[PDB]
Automatic annotation (TrEMBL), chain D:
<protein>
    <submittedName>
        <fullName>TcdA1</fullName>
    </submittedName>
</protein>
Length: 147, 292, 48, 49, 98, 49
């Protein structure tokens, strides 16, 4: 577990948070955190996102450890448009993810922040608004589940 | 040909030299509507900007219908035409709309030529300076002229705004500074979230200033060394000067000063525990102003 | 705090307390903690 | 590829300098706390002399 | 007849690192105890005890500085050990060039 | 007074240490900034080949 902590590169207090409250990192409620590679990759992604936040990370993590973080503060932290993050969160809420994303966890659970960031990354890859991805994912034309 | 038309030919010769843009683009920069007329056996500016290539066999022209610029509205083909012409997404389109006019309560705008010309003016303001809509907005806020609306502005005022933007962009390029850094240094709104650095600052100041006597010595001079230690300063008098400047500014939504900060720390602060205090957000704002 | 009781009984100043709780801080590994007590004792001897 | 690796190695060393204990912010705090103690203890010393 | 466009890659991003802080609560005073010694003696006692503590604090600071510098010393060696392999590959491909 | 001299020697040692560590952090941030141009030069050498 030392080799884990040093290889992941996560900050000491977010490692404390991960150990104490796996639910905040979206691990299954009521179970000890896994050092499975599946958890290792998400820990690495969290550390990379924290490093990307730069100097703002100090305030972002504090607002994340409370149930305080919002779209506008995180948008200022990542130098992104607040409307962009708000609409990406709206689109994620509208669509059926597993686990489901709801306004009271959308910036409270790491799985929800990661889903929103994936939406934002895919939108900016396509150089379109998240409504563009929402229109795209409706084109399930090879299925019988829905019209 | 008269004084009025002869006044802005000098301006367009300047813009075509400085920015190396075409004549029509410079005229747009001179607060002139887009020309529907096509001459010189060339497609018109409106046609080149919107009509070509034709999108799904639909011809775009000025009309009395109303077009929505709300990003989440998922507008009709006209919004797609605007996005393709301006090479921007829906969110940045709404941001550009907010930049151009502050009187547009809703995203819906008139499809007349004047609004399109205003939007093109706003887009070219960022295009000529190699910035996108986000840095354009943050730059206008950092300048202080962002309050003024581009839709309703005088030609001389627009020229002054252009000169201010060009000068600040040149200064930033000379200083190797990003627009975000300038916005942070010139920002007034402060995040009201407790941080470990702010908590350490509060603990150090509370421990150092305990037992302080008002008449024995100046409060600011006594508080300066702990502020310097906590906020990573090389010199103590730099912290003293920063504290004087902050007291003159009175940062935050609840005007904060050294006496008020010391009284709050003395009375309502309990070090080593995480508790919610009504005034704590103002304390955080004051600390953020000091760090800035 | 035992020297502070000795002070508060050789003199009658039961109210006068000189040792503060801030001498140790776990953020900075408790460095320089002794020099704050050394200053507190110097203030106690000077007042004494 | 070698130069790109060196960029990562320089970032890793910079991160180690920022994240370690015995860093700039600890020494800044040590300087401020000690300077305040030093001036108070000087006022006590001169009163004793 | 058509010559394709010579698209060219942009500059590398500046890598950025995050530096966060840790905070730990204020200390708590023991219960004071009243003892049989007149103040000058209990003061010479305590003052001695405190000066011993300051000496442990100076040893502790010296240890912290030393161990951090030795962790940097080991980092630079493992980093140059990793840097050498690419130079070996470059020299080998220079031989194939000759 | 001898106690004060001892606080003064600790203070001088702190001042020297913190200034050297601020130089240590300056040289790393400065080499981190210097690396980018070398990367650009190597990339344009590839286009030369």
């Amino acid at each position: 577990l030392e080799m884990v902590y040093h290889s992941t590169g996560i900050n000491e207090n977010a490692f404390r948070l991960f150990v104490t409250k796996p639910e905040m990192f979206g691990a299954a409620t009521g179970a000890a955190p896994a050092h499975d590679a599946l958890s290792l990759i998400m820990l690495t992604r969290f550390a990379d996102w924290v490093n990307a936040l730069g100097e703002k990370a100090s305030s972002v993590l504090a607002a994340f450890e409370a149930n305080s973080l919002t779209a506008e503060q995180l948008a200022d932290a990542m130098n992104l448009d607040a409307n962009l993050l708000l609409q990406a969160s709206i689109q994620a809420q509208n669509h059926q993810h597993l686990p489901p994303v709801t306004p009271e966890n959308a910036f409270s659970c790491w799985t929800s922040i990661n889903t929103i960031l994936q939406w934002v990354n895919v939108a900016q890859q396509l150089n379109v608004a998240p409504q563009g991805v929402s229109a795209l994912v409706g084109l399930d034309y090879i299925q019988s589940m829905k019209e | 040909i008269n004084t009025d038309v002869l006044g802005k030919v000098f301006l367009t010769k300047y813009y075509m030299q400085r920015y190396a843009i075409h004549a029509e683009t410079a005229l747009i920069l001179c607060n002139a509507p887009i020309s529907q007329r096509s001459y010189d056996n060339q497609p018109s500016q409106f046609d080149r900007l919107f009509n070509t290539p034709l999108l799904n066999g639909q011809y775009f022209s000025t009309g009395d219908e109303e077009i929505d610029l709300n990003s989440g509205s998922t507008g009709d083909w006209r919004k797609t035409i605007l996005k393709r012409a301006f090479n921007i997404d829906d969110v940045s389109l709404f941001r550009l709309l907010w930049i151009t006019d502050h009187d547009n309560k809703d995203g819906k705008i008139k499809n007349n030529l004047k609004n399109l010309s205003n939007l093109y003016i706003g887009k070219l303001l960022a295009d000529i300076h190699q910035l996108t809509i986000d840095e354009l907005d943050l730059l206008l806020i950092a300048v202080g002229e962002g309050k003024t609306n581009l839709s309703a502005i005088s030609d001389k005022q627009l020229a002054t705004l252009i000169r201010k933007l060009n000068t600040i962009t040149s200064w930033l390029h000379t200083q190797k500074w990003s627009v975000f850094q300038l916005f942070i240094m010139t920002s007034t709104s402060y995040n009201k979230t407790l941080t470990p650095e702010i908590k350490n600052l509060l603990d150090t100041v509370y421990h150092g200033l305990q037992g302080f006597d008002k008449d024995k010595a100046d409060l600011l001079h006594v508080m300066a060394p702990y502020i310097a230690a906590t906020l990573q300063l090389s010199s103590e008098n730099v912290a003293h000067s920063v504290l004087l400047w902050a007291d003159k500014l009175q940062p935050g939504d609840g005007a904060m000063t050294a006496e008020k900060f010391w009284d709050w720390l003395n009375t309502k602060y309990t070090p080593g525990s995480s508790e919610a205090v009504e005034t704590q957000e103002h304390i955080v704002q004051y600390c953020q102003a000091l760090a800035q | 705090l035992m020297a502070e009781q000795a002070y508060r009984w050789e003199l009658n100043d039961d109210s006068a307390r000189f040792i503060k709780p801030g001498a140790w801080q776990g953020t900075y590994a408790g460095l320089l903690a002794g020099e704050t007590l050394m200053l507190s004792l110097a203030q106690m001897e000077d007042a004494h | 590829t070698s130069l790109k690796t060196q960029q990562e190695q320089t970032q890793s060393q910079l991160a180690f300098l920022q994240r370690k204990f015995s860093n700039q912010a600890l020494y800044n705090w040590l300087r401020g706390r000690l300077a305040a103690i030093y001036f108070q203890f000087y006022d006590l010393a001169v009163a004793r002399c | 007849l058509y010559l394709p466009i010579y698209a060219t890659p942009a500059d590398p991003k500046a890598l950025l690192s995050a530096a966060v802080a840790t905070s730990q609560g204020g200390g708590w005073l023991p219960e004071s105890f009243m003892s049989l010694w007149r103040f000058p003696h209990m003061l010479e006692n305590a003052r001695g005890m405190v000066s011993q503590l300051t000496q442990f604090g100076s040893t502790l600071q010296n240890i912290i500085e030393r161990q951090d510098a030795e962790a940097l010393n080991a980092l630079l060696q493992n980093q140059a050990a990793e840097l050498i392999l690419t130079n070996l590959s470059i020299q080998d491909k220079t031989i194939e060039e000759l």
